[PDB]
Design a protein around this ligand. Sequence first.
Ligand SMILES: CC(C)CCC[C@@H](C)[C@H]1CC[C@H]2[C@@H]3CC=C4C[C@@H](O)CC[C@]4(C)[C@H]3CC[C@]12C
Ligand SMILES: CN(C)CCOC1=Cc2ccccc2Sc2ccc(Cl)cc21
Ligand SMILES: [Zn+2]
Length: 370
Amino acid sequence: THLQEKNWSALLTAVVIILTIAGNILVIMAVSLEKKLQNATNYFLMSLAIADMLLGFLVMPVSMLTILYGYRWPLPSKLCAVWIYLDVLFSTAKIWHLCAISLDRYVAIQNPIHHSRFNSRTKAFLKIIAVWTISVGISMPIPVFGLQDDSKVFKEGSCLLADDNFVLIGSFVSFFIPLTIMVITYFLTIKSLQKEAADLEDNWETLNDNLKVIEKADNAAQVKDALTKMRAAALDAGSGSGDILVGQIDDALKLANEGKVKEAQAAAEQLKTTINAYIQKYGQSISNEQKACKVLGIVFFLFVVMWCPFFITNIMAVICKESCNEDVIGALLNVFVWIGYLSSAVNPLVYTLFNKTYRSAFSRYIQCQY
Ligand SMILES: CC(C)CCC[C@@H](C)[C@H]1CC[C@H]2[C@@H]3CC=C4C[C@@H](O)CC[C@]4(C)[C@H]3CC[C@]12C
Ligand SMILES: CN(C)CCOC1=Cc2ccccc2Sc2ccc(Cl)cc21
Ligand SMILES: [Zn+2]
């Protein structure tokens, strides 16, 4: 029965490993091939996928091997610190990539021309490298104090974080703080997007009012005034996209400057439909931003929820070092770490479920259609 349980646990963990590897390889392929997904957010998501693939290649199979050997470290003792370091490094890179995505998208939408078509690809790669560097800096104390002292990474022959200060500082620096920052940034982001939609409605109101004023105008001065208001409104409502709409308003304005009232009014009549179409397009862009915000919130929520039992049990075990049952806590950790690895695997499934570009790319990759 003991062998039965360890063999089925190892098999389930192997299923989790293969799902992780396949899904994250597919995500890497989709981001590197599909030209629609060439923004900074998808670059960060591919970095996340690479981190998950490294976690499934370097950490999860060694964890399965540890399971097979009754949780006694089979490899040399110096490799336990390296294993814990790689695990912590990849998980910290994941969580801080999510936090960086949140902050970056928020600060981005805080920019009046952030619907422009000029987004720098190189800067995203630089930010990703900086996040990897700060993750390495966060994780380095674990090898530092683990290669010197074997007691902080070993507990009765098993390989796991044993230092209480290590567990506390790690749980705060790599889990709690980014979680709080992400929650706050998420709510601030929904507020900014609401403000964006409100301003868009305001610009549409201005465009409609002045269109009617143009429809019933006597002289060129009235037409020019209404067109000036319209131009400012349309420029603000483009939010940086760079449209023909302001140029067409400038054409009408030029007509009005020449004292040609009837022709300016005809130009405005033409402008009505163009204005409606472009306003609808701008609101669609805002809605797309909202949908991306919700999808990334789903991803962050899944990661946090699926890792929370492990961190809760770890903090609890550090609090009641001898008051609580350590065997049951050991089993709880041995299950919750794999729950967190399942979180590491789940993300490509979400990308498929809620992103049509990813879904079509994956459907074509499964059938080897490149
Ligand atoms: C193309 C873009 C989006 C993805 C780039 C991924 C790069 C920057 C990431 C993915 C895997 C990362 C590596 C993962 C493991 C290690 C070993 C560690 O001891 C030092 C950091 C180092 C070497 C990381 C450096 C940064 C790294 C190479
Ligand atoms: C050997 N393996 C099990 C270590 C993995 O534990 C951790 C995972 C993580 C998961 C998700 C985000 C961040 C981490 S950073 C971390 C920090 C402190 C401790 Cl105590 C654990 C810990
Ligand atoms: Zn926007």
